[PDB]
Amino acid sequence: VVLPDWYEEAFVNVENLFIDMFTDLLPDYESGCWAPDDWLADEIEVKPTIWFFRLPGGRVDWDGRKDECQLQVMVVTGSRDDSWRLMDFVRAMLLPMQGDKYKMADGYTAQIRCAGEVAGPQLLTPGQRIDTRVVTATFKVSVSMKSAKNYKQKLYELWQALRG
Amino acid sequence: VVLPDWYEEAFVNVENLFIDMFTDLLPDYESGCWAPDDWLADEIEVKPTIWFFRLPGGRVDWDGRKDECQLQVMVVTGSRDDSWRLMDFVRAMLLPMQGDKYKMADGYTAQIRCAGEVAGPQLLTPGQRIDTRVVTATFKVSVSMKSAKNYKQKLYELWQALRG
Amino acid sequence: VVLPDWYEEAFVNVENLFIDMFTDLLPDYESGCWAPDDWLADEIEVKPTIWFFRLPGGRVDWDGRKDECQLQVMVVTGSRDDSWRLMDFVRAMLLPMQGDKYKMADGYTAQIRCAGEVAGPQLLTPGQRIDTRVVTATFKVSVSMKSAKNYKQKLYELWQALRG
Amino acid sequence: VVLPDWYEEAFVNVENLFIDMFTDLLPDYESGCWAPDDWLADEIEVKPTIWFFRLPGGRVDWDGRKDECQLQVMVVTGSRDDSWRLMDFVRAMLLPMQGDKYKMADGYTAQIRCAGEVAGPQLLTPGQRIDTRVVTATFKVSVSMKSAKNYKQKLYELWQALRG
Amino acid sequence: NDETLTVYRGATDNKGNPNKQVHGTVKGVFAWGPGTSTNKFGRDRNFKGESSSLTAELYVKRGADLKARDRIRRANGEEYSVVGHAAWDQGHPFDGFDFGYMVFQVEAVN
Amino acid sequence: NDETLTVYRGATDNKGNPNKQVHGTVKGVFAWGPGTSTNKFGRDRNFKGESSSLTAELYVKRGADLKARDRIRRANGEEYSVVGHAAWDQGHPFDGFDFGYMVFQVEAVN
Amino acid sequence: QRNVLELIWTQDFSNIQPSEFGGIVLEAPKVPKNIYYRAILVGMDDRNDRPIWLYWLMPKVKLDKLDNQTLNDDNVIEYKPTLKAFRDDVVGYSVAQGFAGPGWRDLVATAGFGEALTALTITPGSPTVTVATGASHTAQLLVEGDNGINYTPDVVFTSSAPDKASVSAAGLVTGVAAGSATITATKGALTATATVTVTA
């Protein structure tokens, strides 16, 4: 952590927002954006996990203070019915999101503008993992920006100090 | 270096501009467009590096003195959070760039017109490198031309001298 | 060489035009459309070479006396900077080409109408060749036709002589 | 050959037209639509051959008495210059074709309406064959129909005789 | 014993036009297999028509006129192409004895 | 016995411009095959033109100046590139005897 | 540049002078003057060393309408004003199409203009050139066809007797030795014979 002090942050990291809000909603079922070794230790019985991986798609405008990304939702568990009901719960908690606030442990509270839908649920065939049931879907999630002020100034004075 | 003297240069090499400006901004963290052997020597602990590789996309007009390319930004480091914050810093330093100047060690100062965005961040799965976290995104960067004068004359007299 | 005498030629072979003009411009650096064994003999130190390979794309009209092709430019050398400056020189000698003449050793002088641009520079990863640096770009080059007279007559009398 | 007598033929087999007309034009150089074993016997020195293979593309209307197909032109020989000049001769004999007649050994004379162009020359890399030089091009050739009368009648009486 | 082989030598220039001429006659033997089996015949598949692909080994005397990137014609009519530098072209690392034999991975196309 | 080999050493920086200079001479022998056969020659296929690919093994004395990510030129003119750390570079696990030999998987491109 | 701004603003920026620091102002007229301009619209086409020249001659033109220009960050400023050609009085023509160039001479007969080229003759019948460097030491040839058009720059001349007089492609007749020589002029199909007498 040696980033310059005059710069604090640019974006919200909406996947961190989502994983934190899902962990807070139901602490019993863990959620994240990785594959912990503890979860991979047991496969016949697996704790239901929600995974969010960023996918390409969607432009961005700094002037309009708008950001969007095609963040996908992937749920894995030991039963097809459990996976389907978890996906239904996630869709009920994401699709009807129009101007909703949620606060992170960092201090700032994010603003979700609209969470769209691109592709429906995908019951992927069991490959490397057989017993676990996995369902994949993609959401078009648009989020606001924390700070949209431009950093032309400091770059300009750094350039002037370095060369002139 | 045996290029003809009457020709000096045509384009700006915007990736050299970007790597030089990022190295000047934070000299502690190295940045470039290759994979140095010193960086590849250690992989459990890696110095954060910013890589710019040119990708196809975007036309060019000599008459309008405008050039554009789909230069991509790839950041590699030992932590997902570090990679995400570095990508956020890069995006904050690139997207709000509208008519900005920066001087190279060659002598000329380039002019960045507008740096767009095509695809969002890509958390690539760990393949050959496991511990390192890599995030890939593509930027639509448009840069001005240094000199747009035509070289019809010298080619014509060379042709006349060679044949006639 | 047993082609009929009444037919001399149809097209210009614009890649031959380009390789000949580049060889004439700088005879020290060889250029062509193949891979000579002498060049492949040494790889740590390589003479810079310009390669033109024809690619699909672009229609043609005999009535309008206009021909076009998506001829690509590929440069290979022992340094990335040398490859970049050679590509810049090629673009300076190609993009500002609007109605330019150049004579071949055959006897006719070709007329380059306009050399467009499709894809930007491609810094291909070192595969079979490691030390050499290669950059690939595609140009939309349109060239005029040498002779556009129709050969309906001779075919018709040949058909009449053969059958009737 | 046990086809019904009331049906004689439907289409022209335009590739047979082209191979026959090219063989008649220059009998010294053989041309066809296959790979004879005699030609494959010798590869260092090869007799120049013109190959026409049918490719998809182009609709057809029985009412308008019009047919079209994306027949491609592939030339193979022992020298790049020979292949290029042969392709130029083929384009000179094919592109300026607007309402041209040529008679087959079957008895009917075909009518070539227009021979368009889709893709430019393709200097394929030497794979299985190394010494031989091959250039591939695709032509949009439109040809007329020999007989466009409908065969509803005979099918109807055959159906009536079989079932009723 | 051995059978004479016709060798064709030529270097492709920037124009891409091969110029192969007769370089003489070379004595060698063919080996259609590394061990007790034989190499399978390749299938063109994509190429329009029918053909075959073969990779054999050629044994020739040391210091022969044959060199890589050349063409070889047998006594029956088939023409082969040899690529790559000769292998096992060195003496004994311990003592320095010379076998006088080298292997050429010649590609049979006819 | 052995034959001298020219070694070229260079480290690519962020600019991507290799700087290979002469590092001296190294003594070693080549082995174009793991056992009683020889490695097949690769085909570029996609590359415009004709070339070859080869993966050989290089035997060198222990503690030599040769190191991975270097270039090797033979006495005939062919230039090879060696990648990857040396293998079998350890003593006897049970007793501790040192053979003094290491294998380098050098890629032959010329 | 000067002409573009003058045409787009309908003024005469002759009295204007750049300031000591380069500051300039382009002033729109208080009353829009209807200044007329001379326009030449010439094209180019090349056939070997003899190109084709075509032009749209017009001795009177003025502004008709200026389209809306976009100066955003994706292209340079675009000035695309349409001009309506007018009719001039001192010359009597408004729009004229003209073809020129050495190449046009080759296909002028094919285009149907005039008559087909079927006859040719070298205008100097028996030119006399002095061996010494005198007033008439050098002579210039000029072959004339049936169409009344010169064919000197394209038709090459071959001297059957270089010892007496040699004629190059330029048609020069200097003379090496006194005597009579025969010169043949051909372009691609027509042969013309001329006799040149050389004396001291």
Rg of the Cα atoms in chain A: 19
Q: How far apart are CA G131 and CA D25, in angstroms?
A: 58
For E12, the closest of C19, C30, C34 (CB atoms) is C34
Q: Would you tell me how many other CB atoms lie within 10 Å of the CB of residue D132?
A: 19
Q: Do residues G157 and G106 make contact, with C-beta atoms less than 8 angstroms apart?
A: no
Of C120, A151, C92, C74, nearest in space to B52 by CA = C120
Start-to-end Cα distance in chain D: 30
Give the CA distances from residue D22 to residues C155, D19, D33, D86, in Å, rounded to whole numbers and listed in that order: 10, 5, 12, 11
**Could you say which DSSP state residue G48 is in?**
T
Element (H, E) at B86: helix B80-94
CB–CB contact F49 D126 (8 Å)? yes
> Which residues are paired to G139 by β-bridges?
G173
C99: contact with G, CB 8 A cutoff:
yes
Of C108, C97, C105, C102, nearest in space to C146 by CA = C108
3-state helix, strand, coil in chain A (%, to 5): 25, 30, 45
Q: Which residue in E6, E9, E17, E73 has the most chain D C-beta atoms within 10 A of its own C-beta, making it the best mutation to test that interface?
A: E17
Q: How far apart are CA B157 and CA C134, in angstroms?
A: 31
What values do phi and psi take at D158, rounded to 5?
-65, -45
CB–CB contact B158 C24 (8 Å)? yes
Start-to-end Cα distance in chain F: 24
Q: Which chains touch A (3 or more CB pairs under 8 A)?
A: B
Q: Which chains touch B (3 or more CB pairs under 8 A)?
A: A, C, F, G
Q: What is the dihedral of CA B116, B118, B123, B125, to 10 degrees?
A: -140
User: Between D14-25 and C152-162, two packed helices, what is the crossing angle to 10 degrees?
Assistant: 90
Q: Which residue has the tokens 């010798």?
A: D42
Q: What is the dihedral of CA D114, D119, D120, D122, to 10 degrees?
A: -130
What's the length of chain C? 164
Give the CA distances from residue D103 to residues D12, D56, D97, in Å, rounded to whole numbers and listed in that order: 11, 26, 15
What amino acid occupies position G150? N
CB–CB contact F15 B33 (8 Å)? yes
Q: Do residues E9 and C14 make contact, with C-beta atoms less than 8 angstroms apart?
A: no
Q: Which residues of F touch E57 (CB under 8 A)?
A: 38
CB–CB contact A11 B91 (8 Å)? yes
CB–CB contact C34 D121 (8 Å)? no
CB–CB contact E12 C30 (8 Å)? no
Q: How was this structure determined?
A: cryo-EM
Q: Do residues G120 and G190 make contact, with C-beta atoms less than 8 angstroms apart?
A: yes
Q: Which two tokens stand for residue E72?
A: 């070889």
Show the CA angle centred on residue C73, arms to residues C69 and C77, nearest 5°. 165
What values do phi and psi take at C68, rounded to 5?
-145, 155
Of A147, C76, B110, nearest in space to F51 by CA = C76
Q: Which two tokens stand for residue D55?
A: 């490719």
User: In chain A, which residues touch B (CB < 8 A)?
Assistant: 2-4, 7, 9-11, 13, 33-34, 53-60, 62, 69-70, 148, 150-152, 155-156, 158-159, 162-163
Element (H, E) at C38: helix C37-41
What values do phi and psi take at E59, rounded to 5?
-105, 125
Give the CA distances from residue D6 to residues A131, D3, D13, D151, in Å, rounded to whole numbers and listed in that order: 65, 9, 20, 9
Q: Which residues of D touch F46 (CB under 8 A)?
A: 125
B158, burial (CB in 10 Å: exposed 0-12, middle 13-18, buried 19+): middle
Q: Which two tokens stand for residue A23?
A: 């962990």
